[PDB]
Design a protein around this nucleic acid. Structure first.
Length: 583
RNA sequence: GCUUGCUCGGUUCGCCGAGACUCCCCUACGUGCUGCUGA
DNA sequence: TCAGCAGCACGTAGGGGAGAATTGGCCA
DNA sequence: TGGCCAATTC
């Protein structure tokens, strides 16, 4: 039973007026402002809006919320339902924490009563509402327009709104295909492939780009080309696939080529399909974001044959393997030990059904291919650069009282560390290069000079063994001694300040998307190699859950791709139905 | 068996080589590794 | 052996969304 | 009659 509905995004070509001026947006905004600004008693009082005309009209009458001319039941049932569910979402967010605390309290109290100890006093349950009765965590306005059956997208016709500078395809005719034979384009004409490039052209089912695609002309370091946005815009607009959504007197026109590419790359259809049946692979209820200008379509329930599973763990995994091998008794596995050296390590095996037991048969071991490792390294360099820039900006814009403290924290060089150490009677002939975090050569030198008071001794518990161990203070411990810290008050401030600027810079989101895409590339490569190495269509992913001065600085590359690769591998259960054995 | 958009590269600048495709709102300040303490 | 608490690292956590078949008033 | 678009509803 296919149950996943992935998205597809299309661009908006022409509007009657900005979406923020439509009555549906205004009524949504008003309803949300009303509901989020009322008490618990009023929510019960103002909660009989119903799913009917005779109830919605009275709700808008007594509450006083302006209807702004929007009086559609099928589009208001979404607005009211979403608003009240968002209202109820804070309450149960608080309730979940409350019931976690209640579960720990119940277990601790019953254990104490079994041991004879009286139950401990329970913690004061946090409340979702404030003093007067309003919600402390007030939800914000959702700036989205949810289309409905009565305003479903339809192919554009000249006898609909003839003011468009566009054209319109026949909804029943086959959709146009791109440039069929690019090698026969005359010289000096757009799309011309020069002779020298012709021998080394690609032979796979690569996505064809038109000559006016912005990816072909974007301002790159080594392009030596000129970008004319108007020319590419008009060239693209001459060959669009327009669809239209009409809500009341307003309308928007969307370019359906995004839907076309979505259906082509997924293989749910073949070239030679009409606009009526292109729209039939998606729901009739897209979502509009006015700030961007994107219409997000969602695949209809059945277009993508993905049964979204969840990452299994423990006993259930054994029966998962048994069920998989019961139908097809040849199942492939990949063991991703991504902790060591190169980002991804694999271990393929083919497992059969021995009645009730498993007999794994190894099939090899590979690593992440080199040509992808350069891409990962390039991304890491770019991400380090942008992280340094955003951190520097956050420090610069920090409040002056915290600015001075942070700046003074960030001068702790080796010479500055050595200065006060030498001032403490320590000689400079120490092997400064040769310390580790465990060495005590400074303490040994101080003791050899008779300086016993300065060498502080720490009593360390011997784990499970009773007794405390007296040890000379670590040299790295002396390093902590020389450096004052931010007393976990300024650290809070800089964290909140860097989160905001990290959200705000348009580069950080771009490199976050790039990290996600690179992780997905790694996962896709491993999945394809698992299929090719095991010769089985059904597979399963068994994931298993220098220098002295360099010790002063944080580790540049210690654990970066681990979490993103783990998330990408766990996403196969959510997006593509691949079983994931987290062990 | 691939026309828009997005990401990364090559170039004779004419376009071509390689990618991702579960995404949106919203509200918080957390999730951490650990170094010590009590069973 | 897992339960709190201090200096350190980066996004984490968790609420809310992402229809469509049938039908009744409906005038020409 | 049959057509058209809101309005019920799960």
């Amino acid at each position: 039973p296919a149950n996943f509905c992935p998205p597809a995004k299309v661009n908006i070509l022409a509007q009657s007026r900005p979406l923020s001026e439509w009555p549906i947006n205004l009524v949504s905004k008003g309803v949300q402002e009303y509901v989020y600004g009322l008490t618990a008693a009023e929510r019960e009082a103002n909660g009989d809006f119903g799913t009917s005309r005779k109830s919605l009209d009275r709700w808008f009458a007594r509450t006083g919320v302006p209807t702004h001319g929007y009086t559609t039941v099928q589009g208001l049932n979404l607005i009211l339902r979403h608003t009240f569910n968002r209202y109820d979402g804070v309450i149960k967010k608080v309730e979940t924490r409350n019931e976690k605390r209640r579960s720990k309290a119940t277990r601790i109290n019953v254990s104490r009563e079994a041991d004879g100890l009286p139950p401990i006093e329970a913690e004061p349950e946090e409340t979702a509402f404030g003093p007067d009765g309003k919600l402390k965590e007030r939800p914000g306005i959702n700036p989205s327009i949810y289309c409905y059956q009565q305003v479903s997208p339809v192919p554009y016709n000249p006898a609909k709104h003839p003011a468009l500078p566009f054209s319109g395809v026949d909804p029943g005719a086959p959709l146009p295909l791109g440039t069929p034979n690019r090698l026969s384009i005359p010289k000096g004409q757009p799309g011309y492939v020069p002779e020298w490039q012709r021998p080394h052209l690609s032979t796979k089912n690569k996505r064809i780009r038109k000559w006016y695609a912005r990816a072909n002309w974007r301002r790159k370091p080594g392009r030596k080309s000129v970008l004319d946005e108007a020319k590419l815009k008009e060239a693209a607009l001459k060959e669009a696939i327009p669809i239209i959504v009409t809500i009341g007197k307003d309308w928007i026109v969307m370019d359906a080529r995004g839907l076309l590419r979505a259906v082509y790359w997924r293989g749910i259809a073949k070239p030679g399909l009409s606009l009526k049946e292109l729209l039939g692979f998606f729901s009739g209820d897209p979502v509009l974001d006015p700030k961007r200008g994107i219409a997000t379509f969602t695949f209809k329930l059945g277009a993508v044959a993905v049964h979204s599973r969840k990452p299994t763990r423990g006993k259930k995994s054994k029966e998962l393997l048994l069920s998989m091998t019961a139908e097809k008794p040849h199942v492939g596995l990949v063991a991703i030990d991504l902790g060591q050296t190169n980002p991804v390590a694999a271990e393929f095996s083919r497992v059969k059904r021995e009645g009730e037991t498993l007999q794994a048969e190894p099939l090899g071991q590979i690593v992440l291919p080199d040509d992808l490792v350069k891409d990962l390294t390039r991304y890491r360099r770019a991400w380090d650069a942008t992280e340094e820039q955003i951190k520097a900006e956050a420090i610069v814009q920090l409040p002056e009282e915290c600015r001075a403290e942070v700046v003074k924290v960030n001068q702790m060089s080796a010479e500055e560390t050595k200065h006060l150490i030498l001032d403490r009677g320590v000689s400079g002939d120490l092997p400064w290069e040769k310390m580790t975090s465990n060495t005590t050569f400074i303490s040994d030198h101080l003791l050899a000079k008779g300086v016993t008071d300065q060498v502080f001794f720490e009593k360390k518990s011997k784990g499970k063994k009773k007794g405390t161990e007296t040890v000379k203070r670590k040299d790295y411990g002396w390093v902590k001694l020389l450096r004052p810290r931010l007393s976990q008050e300024t650290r809070k401030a800089v964290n909140d300040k860097t989160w905001e600027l990290k959200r705000a810079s348009t580069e950080y989101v771009r490199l976050s998307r790039r990290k996600t895409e690179l992780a997905r590339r790694c996962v896709n490569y491993i999945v394809r190699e698992t299929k090719r190495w095991t010769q089985c269509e059904d597979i399963a992913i068994v994931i298993e859950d220098d220098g002295w001065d360099n010790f002063f600085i944080s580790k540049r590359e210690n654990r970066w791709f681990i979490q993103v690769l783990h998330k990408a591998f766990s996403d196969l259960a959510l997006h593509r139905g691949l079983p994931v054995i987290e062990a």
